[PDB]
DNA sequence: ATCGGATGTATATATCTGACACGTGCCTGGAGACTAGGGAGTAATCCCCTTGGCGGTTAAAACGCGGGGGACAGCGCGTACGTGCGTTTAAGCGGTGCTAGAGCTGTCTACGACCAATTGAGCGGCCTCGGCACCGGGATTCTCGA
DNA sequence: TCGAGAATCCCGGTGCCGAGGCCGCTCAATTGGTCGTAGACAGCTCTAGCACCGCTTAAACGCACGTACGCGCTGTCCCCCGCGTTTTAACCGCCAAGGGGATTACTCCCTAGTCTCCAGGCACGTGTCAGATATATACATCCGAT
């Protein structure tokens, strides 16, 4: 089970709608998979140093207290999950 | 596996600022994580100070100081005070 | 044999004793002030009893008894000084507090 | 004779309903699929929490409404209402991304 | 020896210095004591904590490993003094 | 006839042995003057290391200049040459400053 | 007073990749406390997973881990394999 | 600038409920009591960095002074983007079923902890001298009017 | 556009002190036992994840299309660059006082560590209403004709 293009299956209302909830009136089209890349590139470290964290946790099922460090040491510390 | 938390007590203080207001489990556990984020805040702070000082021991005057480095103006002021009542209801134990 | 949990000494909710294992489990420094243990949950007793309360505004303010992660959000941005505290701070079912921008209206 | 309302205006409500909702604007499958793609590259057939995945679909989001929102304020900068890559790429700049 | 407005102190020329050195041509006037303002409110940080260093310190000098520390605390760390 | 260069060509070359020089631009004694002013605001009569200032002067004129990069930098997302204090305050805005 | 540093193996390792250098003492200083800086970190965040894991005991795994987490790319698999070599070389006598 | 119509949105209502407040029995961390050491606190001493001032210099700052250069305002157009309506599509509910792997307990053991005895790797301190910083001068190259 | 001129690059020479090398002089590193214990590991659960599959549908993609902001260009103003002059105070070098910083030596208050006991906390059941949801309704607001 070989995974892949995922990345497009962010839709373009998708983006819209995450952008009128950052209160954006017009938008162009050059900014969506560019966004996207960004996303991508965005979790491209954390989900890494998650597994990091999975990695010295010595386990094959990876859970939210990883990200929860990453962010952390990401400086974006989120709330809410122990 | 017995999981401590503050539940119980962030409940008390809910109770004991709003009688009336409730709580959802979300923004519960929300409340219990950010208590520990910013405790184990205060901790590596007091803990680098102390080690600045090169004094194995950690006293409240560390947490005054790191919790004055910690809080924006009068917040740390106002803080520190009832942390001074504490100590002080404590000290006069 | 009287007991007295050193909360009550001081009057308080969060527990002294429990705070002291952990901060003992957590190592900081090889030997503790007594003191220090009630001063910090004392702190965290207020700063959490100025963040619930601003959540409760939020809350009974939407006719809302039990208070929404969405108040969390709200309280936590509309304040300076806890804003200040967690700017770097995301929370989660938080969303954005509301804001439009002056040019965004039409003329 | 059919209406239709001016640019931007159900925009507007959109927005305004938006930073009225809280809740996610992303459908959990795709989001969750992506993430297992993205977790293959660095190791093949690992598990995760709905919590944990639901995390990172929070913090990720949020993110991202931080991003188009300063990139927002900066188009507002550039005196245009319309987006363009170079404001987010700028804004990356800025918030040391890269 | 009661001190003021050495923030004017910091003359022009030694702004568009900096400036330059940032690589700007053009400026306007209407920085420069903004600029002013902005090195207040940022210095108005560090030296107070600072001196918080100093201040559990019990010292009356104050030291560079207090704006190290602080700086560190600020995460704007930097090197070359211990 | 006397000779004048044209605008920015002097700065221009200034920029260039600027980023070429890596010692200090601001006069101490007076940036000295101002750390003492604000000090004796929180308290009054501290002494100071002359590498303590050294390295708050330092430190400062590098934030500083980082301002005026990045400021630069909008200012080229803004199209011009000449810099805007909106600018600067943005920039602190993205730089979360705000 | 004994003041430790290692601006000495910084002149050695130097000599090592170029003998025919100097260096300013300003820069050495810069460096050490480069080297002060890398290692609180790594420290920390050793100690930090360790917490996760519950570990009391901080081990060249855990370091390995926290390079990784830290260090990006070739850097990190470099200073991985490096590491490694040393503690074989260690451990082989 | 107004009115009319469309549409979208705030409200009351009803009920459903499942989170949720509430109460339990049982567990162990917290309290209570006792012992030691030794980190911390105090004090006298030394040093010595700092903070203060004084005089001469000029590079630097202040200030002025055109003036070309661009900030900016406006103005045409056009392409790209909102929109509302089509279309089709995976998203979500939900419920099933297997187990791989977390997640727990019980060993037992290697492994630092720690202390004690030993010391040479390293660090403060002392020459020393050579790249390096400065300077002056000559040659090179950009630039602004042909 | 080929010169004039100007800022610069480079070259040789001067003098210097930091970079460095070496020297006394430890204490912190090593070595070697010794011990209680962190966890390594085995070996169990069970459950949460993982995938399956169906059913409904809100949602997504694309179309057409108006349209309106982005963009590109022009002319203006003013204004900040560049240079010239005049003023000054940063700097720099030196001196001096003391006041704090750092040090060491005592001294002992407090905390770590131990042991006892239990009571607040926690997992776990348990009714139950805050509010989720849907519906019809009444109010607000845009958009186009006037």
Chains 1, 5 share one sequence.
Do not use: W
Not at chain 2, 76 to 88: F, Q, R
Not at chain 4, 74 to 92: E, F, G, N, S, Y
């Amino acid at each position: 089970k070989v995974l892949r293009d995922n990345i497009q299956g962010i839709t373009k209302p998708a983006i819209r709608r995450l952008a009128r909830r950052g209160g954006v009136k017009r938008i162009s089209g050059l900014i969506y998979e560019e966004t996207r890349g960004v996303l991508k590139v965005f979790l491209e470290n954390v989900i890494r140093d998650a597994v990091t964290y999975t990695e010295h946790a010595k386990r094959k099922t990876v859970t939210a207290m990883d990200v929860v460090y990453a962010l952390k040491r990401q400086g974006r510390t989120l709330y809410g999950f122990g | 596996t017995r999981k401590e938390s503050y539940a119980i007590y962030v409940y008390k203080v809910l109770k004991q600022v709003h009688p009336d207001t409730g709580i959802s489990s979300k923004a519960m556990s929300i409340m219990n994580s950010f208590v520990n984020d910013v405790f184990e805040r205060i901790a590596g702070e007091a803990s680098r100070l102390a080690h600045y000082n090169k004094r194995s021991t950690i006293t409240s005057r560390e947490i005054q100081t790191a919790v004055r480095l910690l809080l924006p103006g009068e917040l740390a002021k106002h803080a520190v005070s009832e942390g001074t009542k504490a100590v002080t209801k404590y000290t006069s134990a | 044999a009287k007991a007295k949990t050193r909360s009550s000494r001081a009057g308080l909710q969060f527990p002294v004793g429990r705070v002291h294992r952990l901060l003992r489990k957590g190592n900081y420094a090889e030997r503790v002030g007594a003191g220090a243990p009630v001063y910090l949950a004392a702190v965290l007793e207020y700063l959490t009893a100025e963040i619930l309360e601003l959540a409760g505004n939020a809350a009974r303010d939407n006719k809302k008894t039990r208070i929404i992660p969405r108040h969390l959000q709200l309280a936590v941005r509309n304040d300076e000084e806890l804003n200040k505290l967690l700017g770097r701070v995301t929370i989660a079912q938080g969303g954005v507090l509301p804001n439009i921008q002056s040019v965004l209206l039409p003329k | 004779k059919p209406h239709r309302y001016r640019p931007g205006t159900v925009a507007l409500r959109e927005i305004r309903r938006y930073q009225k909702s809280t809740e996610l604007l992303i459908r959990k499958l795709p989001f969750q699929r992506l993430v297992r793609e993205i977790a293959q590259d660095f190791k093949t057939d690992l598990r995760f929490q709905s919590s944990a995945v639901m995390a990172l679909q929070e913090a990720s989001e949020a993110y991202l409404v931080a991003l188009f929102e300063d990139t927002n304020l900066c188009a507002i900068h550039a005196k245009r209402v319309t987006i363009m890559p170079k404001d987010i790429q700028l804004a990356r700049r800025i918030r040391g991304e890269r």
